[PDB]
Design a protein around this ligand. Structure first.
Ligand SMILES: CC(C)(C)OC(=O)N1CC[C@](C)(N2CCc3c(-c4cnc(N)nc4)nc(N4CCOCC4)nc32)C1
Length: 875
């Protein structure tokens, strides 16, 4: 009953559910109970129009956000019409019969079905369309071309193959979801005292040692940092009150105490942080902290480059056998609470009245209290998220804060201009935020990074997402939204409720939401937040938990298998290693585990029997596994008969994930702007700590393999004409011009992309080509830091390739692609900035992201940046 569900949830998270019941923290227990309304709401949405609504949850329509087709996509159609193949399975022999239609691109699925019934009968509401080869359905009345599969077929010039299926055949396979509810003052503003914190002593701990402290709002100090006196190592007792230059009523809601135990060496003094810890000055119930408190510290993360870690996670280290700092806060003879919104609202009105009479009767000059000014506000509004905003500009923005509500896009600049250590300014900012006009999701996401910790600011950003973020765009930005959950002060927040609700009403989002959280469960700084979020997801996702457990079981077996191969049988032959794999595959636990589950790279792909004869232990770095499964779909032949995936144990696949996501976003920018630059963002998913899956691109070869004619030629005898000749043999005739054009467009896209992103390495073994001419890159080891062979293909064989008309057309493609991404720089700056909490070695500070500002030449004019890019291309 509930014991079965708790066992399944425990296996999915990799933690028994009873371990959450043992947690004494009232915030943990309140999260577990209070989040359940999000679960109830999602389940009710799924039962509204059951079984159609249940079918839409399990198989959501995979559509683009807009039915409007870019002019170059509409041109690929035949006078606005598409040719589709509709297949029917005629029982008993289960024969596949096809019916070819020529219909308007914007025909809804029921119109297509009716037209297929007409063509079939020439020799209605009881049927649905499915994509041949995978579990993707057309259950909603969107125009056919808006479905990503159809849109993808229009571009690429492939013919859509759809399968007609009885509506009842699908609805009968949807089991009944069993969501069951589980078994489980004074005001801050009347305290007229300055903030002081006592550092008592440290347990579980170079010349001397001290405690470095600071009051922060985000990564910004609200006052000067204050240190304790230096003491010899030993078990240091300080018993020292640290006094801060800030008054208790001026503490913002998101104010934090950031601590460090620092080391001093005498040589120039060398200071090093030994351990760190951050504390929210207010708890989840708005209570100001008081009395004695002990904090277990965390190890210093690699690449800290400062004595404190204000961006770091909040709360005590769960491992209690670590450096433990004892602190004491003042007790104001009562439980002190942050004021209600109505109290803050009254003070904001009284502040606007006081700071108006102060303007008239104040003898001094107050920089914080015309058409040239409106143009200066408009120019500041257009600066990128990493551009510096001076103290004079902050005074300018804050003084015109009411004019700012008319350029809603300026909100991030204005929020940075507020004096967060002044309750008079903050109360006024809350009122402006409360009625601020909504902004576009790509702009609201900026307000969810580490720079904006305020709950009202973050609440506004989430409300913009609830109103304007489509499920397509939510899927596209999922990795960032799951990462910014780490910046939230508390377990229960508006962002977590938005993401969970979305995950629980769209199973495609729920699948990736599960894996982005599960993959970080090894990280103790997020284990509890992500584990509690995972329990609430698993409790309400329905039958999909049974499928997720099968994916988890396959991945655990592959980690175990690859662990034995990398450790115990490392130097044994690939034949002897494959004999071990075939022996492990004869064991029932492994036979079940590595077969008959959905692909974690794309749950629409079923993975049937493991085809060991087509598998191999690769000789590449970290010895990955090349795996091959049968696609058990009734029409697998129309998509792919076998699914090939690389399972790698040892590489941090997060940088590859991020690069592949960015390439996808760049391609959408280009496609929407009428720039057909074909990219290949293949699937890559981090499954855990340096473990993951990579999608194998069918019909691909490295430049190295093409160049050495499969072993005959050696590097010393490498002709720069070989690549072009190989492409001509693979595409003879009219299909040759298409291959050269596809090669040109894809090569242009990758030249610009790798340039802007600063992708290193780049050689004949990490650059690949498909039979049809499509060029792509693999293995993006690092980021934020065009051979003669390609020019010969682009110029169709000419020796003076940099002088042909084809090279001028390729150059224009690159310039337009570069300018299109420069126009969307804030989005890319924001996507990188939101990842600053992952702990990726090549993305640790805003200085790393500033590399994009240089390649995009954001401090120049449009014509000055194009000339910079032309100089880089010519060099
Ligand atoms: C049979 C073909 C010609 C396809 O492959 C071959 O013969 N190769 C011989 C070795 C080879 C280069 N290996 C080595 C590493 C590798 C990776 C890879 C590995 N680690 C990260 N982090 N990221 C990507 N990815 C792919 N890709 C296959 C194509 O689809 C995209 C993914 N191949 C790879 C493939």
């Amino acid at each position: 009953e509930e014991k079965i569900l708790n066992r399944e949830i425990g296996f999915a998270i990799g933690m028994p559910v009873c371990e959450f019941d043992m947690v004494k923290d009232p915030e943990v227990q309140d999260f577990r109970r209070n989040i359940l309304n999000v679960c109830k709401e999602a389940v009710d949405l799924r039962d509204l129009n059951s079984p159609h609504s249940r079918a839409m949850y399990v198989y959501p329509p995979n559509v683009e956000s807009s039915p409007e087709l870019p002019k170059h996509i509409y041109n690929k159609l035949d006078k606005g019409q598409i040719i589709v193949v509709i297949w029917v399975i005629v029982s008993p022999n289960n024969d596949k019969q096809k019916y070819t239609l020529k219909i308007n691109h914007d025909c809804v699925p029921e119109q297509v079905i009716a037209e297929a019934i007409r063509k079939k009968t020439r020799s209605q509401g009881k049927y649905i369309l499915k994509v041949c080869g995978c579990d993707e359905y057309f259950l909603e009345k969107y125009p056919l071309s808006q479905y990503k599969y159809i849109r993808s077929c229009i571009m690429l010039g492939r013919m859509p193959n759809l399968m007609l299926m009885a509506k009842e055949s699908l609805y009968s396979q949807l089991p009944m979801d069993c969501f069951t509810m589980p078994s489980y003052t004074k005001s801050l503003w009347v305290i007229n005292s300055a903030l002081r914190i006592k550092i008592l002593c440290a347990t579980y701990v170079i010349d001397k040692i001290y405690v470095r402290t600071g009051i922060y709002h985000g990564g910004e100090p609200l006052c000067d940092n204050v240190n304790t006196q230096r003491v010899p190592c030993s078990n240091p007792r300080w018993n020292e009150w640290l006094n801060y230059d800030i008054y208790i009523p001026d503490l913002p809601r998101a104010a934090r105490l950031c601590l460090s135990i620092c080391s001093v060496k005498g040589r120039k003094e060398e200071h090093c942080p030994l351990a760190w810890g951050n504390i929210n000055l207010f708890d989840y119930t708005d209570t100001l902290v008081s009395g004695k408190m002990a904090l277990n510290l965390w190890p210093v993360p690699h690449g800290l480059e400062d004595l404190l870690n204000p961006i770091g996670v909040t709360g005590s280290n769960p491992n209690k056998e670590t450096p433990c700092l004892e602190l004491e806060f003042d007790w104001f003879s009562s439980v002190v609470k942050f004021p209600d919104m109505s109290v803050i609202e009254e003070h904001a009105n009284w502040s606007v009245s006081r700071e108006a009479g102060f303007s008239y009767s104040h003898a001094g000059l107050s920089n914080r209290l015309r058409e040239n000014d409106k143009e200066q506000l408009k120019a500041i509004s257009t600066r990128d998220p990493l551009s510096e905003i001076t103290e004079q500009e902050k005074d300018f923005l804050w003084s015109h804060r009411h004019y700012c509500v008319t350029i809603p896009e300026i909100l991030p600049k204005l929020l940075l201009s507020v004096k967060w250590n002044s309750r008079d300014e903050v109360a006024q900012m809350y009122c402006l935020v409360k009625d601020w006009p909504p902004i576009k999701p790509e702009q609201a996401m900026e307000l969810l990074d580490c720079n904006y910790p305020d709950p009202m600011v973050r609440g506004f950003a989430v409300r913009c997402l609830e109103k304007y973020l489509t499920d397509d765009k939510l899927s596209q930005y999922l990795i960032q939204l799951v990462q910014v959950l780490k910046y939230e002060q508390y377990l229960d927040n508006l962002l977590v409720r938005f993401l969970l609700k979305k995950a629980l009403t769209n199973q495609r989002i729920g699948h990736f939401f599960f894996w982005h959280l599960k993959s970080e469960m090894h990280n103790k700084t997020v284990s509890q937040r992500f584990g509690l979020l995972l329990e609430s997801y698993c409790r309400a996702c329905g039958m999909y938990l049974k499928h997720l457990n099968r994916q988890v079981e396959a991945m655990e077996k592959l980690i175990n298998l690859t662990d034995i191969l990398k450790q115990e049988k490392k130097d044994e032959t690939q034949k002897v290693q494959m004999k071990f794999l075939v022996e492990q595959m004869r064991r029932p636990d492994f036979m079940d585990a590595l077969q008959g589950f959905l692909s974690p790279l794309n749950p629409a792909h079923q993975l049937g029997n493991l085809r060991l004869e087509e598998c191999r232990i690769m000789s590449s770095a970290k010895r990955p596994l090349w795996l091959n499964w049968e696609n058990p779909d009734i029409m697998s032949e129309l998509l792919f008969q076998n699914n090939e995936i690389i399972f790698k144990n040892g590489d941090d696949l997060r940088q590859d994930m991020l690069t592949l996501q960015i390439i996808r976003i760049m391609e959408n920018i280009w496609q929407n702007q009428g720039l057909d630059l074909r990219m290949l963002p293949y699937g890559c998913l981090s499954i855990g700590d340096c473990v993951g899956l990579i999608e194998v691109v069918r019909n691909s070869h490295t430049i190295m393999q093409i160049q050495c004619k499969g072993g005959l030629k050696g590097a010393l005898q490498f002709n720069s004409h070989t690549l072009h000749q190989w492409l001509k043999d693979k595409n003879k005739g009219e299909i040759y011009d298409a291959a050269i054009d596809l090669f040109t467009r894809s090569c242009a896209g990758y030249c610009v992309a790798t340039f802007i992103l600063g992708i290193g390495d780049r050689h004949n073994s990490n650059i690949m080509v498909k039979d049809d001419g499509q060029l792509f890159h693999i293995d993006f080891g690092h980021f934020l830091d065009l051979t003669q062979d390609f020019l010969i293909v682009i110029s169709k064989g000419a020796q003076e390739c940099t002088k042909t008309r084809e090279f001028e057309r390729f150059q224009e493609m690159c310039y337009k692609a570069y300018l299109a991404i420069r126009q969307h720089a804030n989005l890319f700056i924001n996507l990188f900035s939101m990842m600053l909490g992952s702990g990726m070695p090549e993305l640790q500070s805003f200085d790393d992201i500033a590399y994009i500002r240089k390649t995009l030449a954001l401090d120049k004019t449009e014509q000055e940046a194009l000339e910079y890019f032309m100089k880089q291309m010519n060099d």
